[PDB]
Amino acid sequence: MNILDLFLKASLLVKLIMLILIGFSIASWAIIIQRTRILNAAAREAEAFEDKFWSGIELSRLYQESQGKRDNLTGSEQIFYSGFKEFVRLHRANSHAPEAVVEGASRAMRISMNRELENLETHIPFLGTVGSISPYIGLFGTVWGIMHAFIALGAVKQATLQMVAPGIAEALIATAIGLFAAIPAVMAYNRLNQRVNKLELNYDNFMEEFTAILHRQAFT
Amino acid sequence: MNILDLFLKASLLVKLIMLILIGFSIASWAIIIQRTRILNAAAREAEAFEDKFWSGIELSRLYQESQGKRDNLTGSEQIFYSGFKEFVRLHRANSHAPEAVVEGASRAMRISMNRELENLETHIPFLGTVGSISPYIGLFGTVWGIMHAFIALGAVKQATLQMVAPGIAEALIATAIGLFAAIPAVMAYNRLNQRVNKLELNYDNFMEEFTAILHRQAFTV
Amino acid sequence: TDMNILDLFLKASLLVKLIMLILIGFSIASWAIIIQRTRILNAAAREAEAFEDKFWSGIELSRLYQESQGKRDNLTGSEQIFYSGFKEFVRLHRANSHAPEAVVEGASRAMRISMNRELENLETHIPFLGTVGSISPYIGLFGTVWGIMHAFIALGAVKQATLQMVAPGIAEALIATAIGLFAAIPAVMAYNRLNQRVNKLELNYDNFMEEFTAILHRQAFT
Amino acid sequence: MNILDLFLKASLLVKLIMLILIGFSIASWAIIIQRTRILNAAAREAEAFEDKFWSGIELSRLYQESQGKRDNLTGSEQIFYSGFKEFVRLHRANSHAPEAVVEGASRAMRISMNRELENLETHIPFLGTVGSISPYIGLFGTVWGIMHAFIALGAVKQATLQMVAPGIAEALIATAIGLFAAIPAVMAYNRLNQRVNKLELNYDNFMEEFTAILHRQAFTVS
Amino acid sequence: DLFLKASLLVKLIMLILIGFSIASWAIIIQRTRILNAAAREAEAFEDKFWSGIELSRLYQESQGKRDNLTGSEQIFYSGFKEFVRLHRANSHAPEAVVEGASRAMRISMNRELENLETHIPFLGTVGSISPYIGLFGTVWGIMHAFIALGAVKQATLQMVAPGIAEALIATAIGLFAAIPAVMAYNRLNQRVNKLELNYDNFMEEFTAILHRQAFT
Amino acid sequence: GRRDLKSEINIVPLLDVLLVLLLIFMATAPIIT
Amino acid sequence: LKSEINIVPLLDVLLVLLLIFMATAP
Amino acid sequence: ATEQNDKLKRAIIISAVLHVILFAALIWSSF
Amino acid sequence: ATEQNDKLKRAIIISAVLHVILFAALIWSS
């Protein structure tokens, strides 16, 4: 009955399928606990930065306050620092037309938004593979296990359920574990993509609303 | 009742799966009640502010009423208060272009609209996952019960109902409770999600109206 | 088949009685909603084209507003959007406190509010067909699993057993899935078709409202 | 003995479910074969008109060439013709304010563009319906077959599962043909909606280009 | 061997699924080679465009490699070619010239994306359909079992065994065709969406510098 | 705005009927013996 | 984009297991 | 005007012949 | 900077021990 006794006697292929699906379960739970902590920090930080930035503090003060901690900067604060740093560089060192410095700052923001956003979605597409292939890899382990059983059984002159059923019970483990490795990845991948899309929308709106201030500041 | 002893004697895996699915069933009902209460209040209260705003009352009078309610604010009133406070702040602080105070008000309205929709769609995404995967959690418990039935049918040269029935009862109960935890979430999720989108369209139209009023106000100077 | 469904309903355990009663009810309610909503969407489709033809007849809108006061407490559909828009337009134009640009969107709010109230009267039971089309087979299956467990519990009272004595208990349990699917199939067909029809009438009302707000705008500035 | 004689021996309900699911499989493949050719022609006609519009010909000359085909216009040409007709009407009517002319032309495009898309998607909601109910119609045939088998198994004293093999066989064929009718319809519903959304996006993008042309022309002349 | 003895319908079902297996692997390899080239090419061009070298010099570079023009170079060349065509004709206002040029970017950018994704939609069908072709294969194996088992005094596992063998093998090949296809379809489709956003991002910033060039 | 319609293959009801049918056969195997 | 659980090949396993019980001939 | 109903009937007839060919090929393989 | 990789190694250590004690508790039930 105990799972290890059935695992040790199993064929090499279904035994290898168990190590894959257990490996996906181990890794997907680590990725879920790591990503959900990172997205919680990012959501609270972005919400706190919109309340700071729109408080009416001058961008000279808010920039030099930001600049004091540039080594560990992230989210909307990274987008702001990248934009204003390039805006200052172009408007002070070259003094081109307002649109030429503002598009340069807007490009510098677009780069840092993409760079911050792919740092949120680092290992999320792995969960999208685990949630989609894990039940099929489990079912392939089960179909192989049932065939194997019948291959061992087929030498018998008159078969009966009692001698094939232990082989079917051993083979259903790969379907059960193929689902157990899938459920948590399915729940998480669908939810973490909503949370990243909500942050993408927040950063994108911050870029446009800050670009309007750089546009007006340079025009004046 | 003996039913509790039969439950205690079930496989450890099925005891965990029953706690997960009964936990999802209870959480699903708690969410459906709580979100129905909140969305009823928010739909009624928003409508009861739109008429007040469009009553022909002057907006500075409406704002100084809203200043008396500053901790209780929600919905269209929180969007209005956020827009008008930022409009007054910018239009008072310096000689700004009228587009700049209109953009600033439009932003302060966007921020408070999004922040209020997060207070409405709080546990609706989770309710959607319960309605989606609850039958597949039941299916996993069903395959575990089937496996415990086959390993019993394999054990002795003639099996008996008392030996196989533990695996069958675990599989049937895991099927039934997997459906029972899905049903409330499957009926309520699409309904609640449409009610949040109904209020999103109410707030977006209130923002478009109030933005045009503030633009028409600012260009008088 | 040829087994008595009333005898089955009398024999079955209390929860299978409630599941059969709920699903048979859903089916009756589903057909009652489909018949009623088909007549209402037919009437609303005729009203929309009939009033749009009256509106573009070239008759003066103040005369249509006089005709509408001849049925004030009986307004429906497109004519209700017109009457409520023109009412608010007259009310605001009287208070010269509003520039013409500040009358037209105020009147267009009264139109959008009225269009919303009319769509709530067209759509009223449509989101019930959406639940009958989606939970009904799961309620039927929860009934069966319960009926199958009840059959084996009733069997297990005696150790001497035969497939001949439990087989009718299986057939009596499967009726809950058969009814649960029979209630679901019409509800899915009609929920899709009635949403398609409601979505067309929303588009006619939206197009009418943009056409009429332009008439109010040029008339206010003239 | 064979699938032909099994279908001939099968209960009248299984025959009826067979004819319904064949009828939906016939109709859904006919709709797929028609709609894929309609969308191929419409997507090509849009690209083949828009290149001409951007060839640098005067819009007045393009409109005069289009007037000669008023009875046959479709797609981006019908959107253009509706826009230019209402523009050249509204512009001349009062020597009118350019915003009010250009809004009226953009609205004449929008209503003509929505009126064109309902000619492209005309049968697509039936594929979404067939793909939704066909699993349930097959499953109803399955459950009714299993019920009739288990009732018959309850009538005979020497009951054994060998007595119900043909009853389960027709029940399994009824679900298999259910998924056969469902799968092409669900894949085609998703695919044809993606194509209509891609083509709606192309028409919407053309209305913005033409609105900018009309706004720049109207503010130059009025 | 089993494939020689199996029914004619099962021969076709197994050849269709083996065909979908080898075709889906060939597509996964080839699309990966193409999208690797397109991603490396794009980021190498963006660094050239933002180098501060003037756009007329990049146009003269593009005029030399007109044949092998793909990706951001093929968007740039189409836009700048149309801009020069209309501006040298001088028939229109500068805000109209850049509107026509920006369309000649968008047409060329669609023409590139429709060339990158060219076989990816097929993997979506192979990953969706291979399970149901397996399901049809098993139903035909189960038919070969039930037509025998319903026509004897007492059945045995021995007499149905070839129906089980044909069924399970058709499912195993159905899964083996499905797994690479459903795995790689979402991976490849997400790389196309990354390049679509990268080209759309370029098309706006290039439209903006043309708008300033035209008013200049 | 616009509505939407329920297009997807819900396989769960079919899967549960086949599981219930397998469980009936499996429970009745020692009854038929 | 979404990703649901796909288990369609489990029908194939259940139909084989169902046939195995049918073949036992008690 | 009417050409769309002609092309619809042509598609119905083609699809019906394709089903008759498919179900003939399945029934032929049943022997 | 790079500490998110050490947080990932910590996350693998906790998911691995949680699965080892789950499969041990499951085996210990029989």
What are the tokens at E30? 């080839």
Q: Which residues of B touch A172 (CB under 8 A)?
A: 143, 146-147, 150
Q: What is the CA radius of gyration of chain F?
A: 18
What is the number of alpha carbons within 13 Å of residue A210 lying toward its C-beta?
29
Q: Name the residue of chain D whose CA is nearest to F7's CA.
A: D128
Q: Does I1 touch chain B (CB under 8 A)?
A: no
| Residues of chain G with C-beta less than 8 angstroms from the C-beta of F19 | 14
Which residues in chain E (118-177) have CB-CB distances under 8 A to chain H? 143
What is the spatial distance between Cα E162 and Cα E170, in angstroms, rounded to a whole number? 12
Q: Residue A136: closest CA among chain G residues belongs to which residue?
A: G7
Could you give the CA distance from residue C148 to residue C172 in angstroms, rounded to a whole number? 9
Q: Please give the angle made by the CA atoms of A72, A74 and A75, to the nearest 5 degrees.
A: 170
E177 vs G contacts (CB less than 8 Å): none
Which member of A136, A164, A190 has the closest CB to residue G6? A136
Cα distance from B55 to chain A (closest Cα, Å)? Answer: 31
CB contact under 8 A, E151 and D1: yes
Query: Best residue in I21, I23, I26, I28 to probe B by mutation, most B CBs within 10 Å?
Result: I26
CB pairs under 8 A between E and H: 5
DSSP H/E element including E149: helix E120-149
Is C139 in Cβ contact with B205 (below 8 Å)? Answer: no
Partner-chain contact A172 B143, CB within 8 Å: yes
Candidates D166, D176, D213; nearest CB to E139: D176
Q: Report chain H's C-alpha Rg in angstroms.
A: 14
Report CB contact under 8 Å: F22, G18.
yes
Largest pairwise CA distance in chain B: 98
CA-based nearest residue in chain C for residue D130: C189
Task: Establish if G12 touches chain A: CB-CB under 8 angstroms.
Answer: yes
Q: Does B107 touch chain A (CB under 8 A)?
A: yes
What is the SS3 string spanning chain B? Answer: CCHHHHHHCCCHHHHHHHHHHHHHHHHHHHHHHHHHHHHHHHHHHHHHHHHHHCCCCCHHHHHHHHHHHCCCCCHHHHHHHHHHHHHHHHHHHCCCCHHHHHHHHHHHHHHHHHHHHHHHCCCHHHHHHHHHHHHHHHHHHHHHHHHHHHHHHCCCCCCCHHHHHHHHHHHHHHHHHHHHHHHHHHHHHHHHHHHHHHHHHHHHHHHHHHHHHHHHHHCCC
Taking CB atoms and an 8 Å cutoff, what residues of chain E touch D216?
A: 93, 95-96
E35 neighbors E116 (Cβ within 8 angstroms): yes
D172 → closest Cβ in G15, G24, G26: G15
Cα–chain-centroid distance for residue E166? 33
Question: Which residues of chain E does H31 touch, with a Cβ-Cβ cutoff of 8 Å?
Answer: none
In this complex, the residue of D3, D26, D33 whose CB is nearest that of residue H19 is: D26
**Which of F4, F14, F31, F33 is most worth mutating to test chain D (most D CB atoms within 10 A of its CB)?**
F14
Asked if D161's CB is within 8 angstroms of G22's CB, the reply is yes
Q: Which two tokens stand for residue A142?
A: 């089960």
Which candidate from C164, C165, C177 shows the least CB-CB separation from D143? Answer: C177
Interface test with A, best of E130, E169, E179 (most A CBs within 10 A): E179
| Torsion (CA) A55, A95, A87, E214 in degrees, nearest 10 | 110
CA distance B161 to chain C (A): 8
Which positions in chain B have a beta carbon within 8 angstroms of at least one beta carbon in chain F? 135, 139, 142, 146, 149-150, 153, 158-161, 163-165, 168, 171-172, 175, 179, 201
> Nearest residue on chain G to E169, judged by CA atoms?
G12
- Residues 6 or more apart whose CB falls under 8 angstroms from that of E68 comprise none
Q: Which residue shows structure tokens 């439990």?
A: C166
Contact B132 G4 (CB under 8 A): yes
For chains B and G, CB pairs below 8 A equal 5
Neighbours of A38 (CB within 10 A): 17
Three-state DSSP class for A54? coil
Kindly list the distances between the CA atom of residue G8 and the CA atoms of B171, E131, E171, G13, in Å, as whole numbers in the listed order.
Answer: 19, 6, 10, 10
Question: Solved how?
Answer: cryo-EM
Contact B31, B129 (CB under 8 A): no
Q: What is the CA radius of gyration of chain B?
A: 28
Structure tokens belonging to residue F32: 């038929």
Task: Determine the residue among B150, B163, B168, B196 to mutate to test chain A binding: the one whose Cβ has the most chain A Cβ atoms within 10 Å.
Answer: B150
A14: which residues sit within 8 A by CB, 6+ positions away?
Answer: A141, A144, A145, A148, A170, A171, A174
Task: Please report, as a single letter, which amino acid is at residue C88.
Answer: E
Nearest to B18, CA basis, from B123, B126, B140? B140
CA E47, CA C221: separation in Å to the nearest integer?
Answer: 55
The beta-carbon neighbor of A190 closest among G2, G9, G17 is G2
**CB pair distance less than 8 Å for E7 and H26:** no
3-state secondary structure chain D: CCHHHHHHHCCHHHHHHHHHHHHHHHHHHHHHHHHHHHHHHHHHHHHHHHHHHCCCCCHHHHHHHHHCCCCCCCHHHHHHHHHHHHHHHHHHHHCCCHHHHHHHHHHHHHHHHHHHHHHHCCCHHHHHHHHHHHHHHHHHHHHHHHHHHHHHHHHCCCCCHHHHHHHHHHHHHHHHHHHHHHHHHHHHHHHHHHHHHHHHHHHHHHHHHHHHHHHHHHHHHC
Q: Are A90 and A100 in contact (CB under 8 A)?
A: yes
Q: Are C199 and C72 in contact (CB under 8 A)?
A: no
Is-contact C163 F31, C-beta < 8 A?
yes
Mutate to test the interface with F, among G5, G8, G13, G18 (most CBs of F within 10 A): G18
Q: Which of C152, C188, C199 sits opposite F3 (nearest CB)?
A: C199
Contact, B87 vs B105, CB < 8 A?
A: yes
Determine the residue type at B125: P
Specify the DSSP class assigned to residue A96. Answer: -
| A131 CA to centre of own chain | 13
F7 interfacial to chain B (CB closer than 8 Å): no
Dist. CA B120–CA E38, nearest whole Å: 43
Chains touching H (3+ CB pairs < 8 Å):
D, E
CB-closest option in E138, E175, E178 to G16? E138
- Contacting partners of chain F (3+ CB pairs under 8 A): B, C, D, G
Tokens of B56: 């022909």
What are the residues whose beta carbons fall under 8 Å from the beta carbon of B146, sequence distance 6 or more? Answer: A172, B167, B171, F19, F22, F23, F26
Judging contact as 3 or more Cβ pairs under 8 Å, the answer for I and G is no
Q: In 3D, which of A181, A183, A133 has the Cα closest to residue A23? A: A181
Other C-beta atoms closer than 10 Å to the C-beta of C3 total 15
CA angle in degrees (0–180, nearest 5) for A130-A134-A135: 140
D169 in reach of chain C (CB within 8 A): no
Residues C33/C125, Cβ–Cβ less than 8 Å: yes
User: Distance between CA atoms of F1 and C199, rounded to whole angstroms?
Assistant: 8
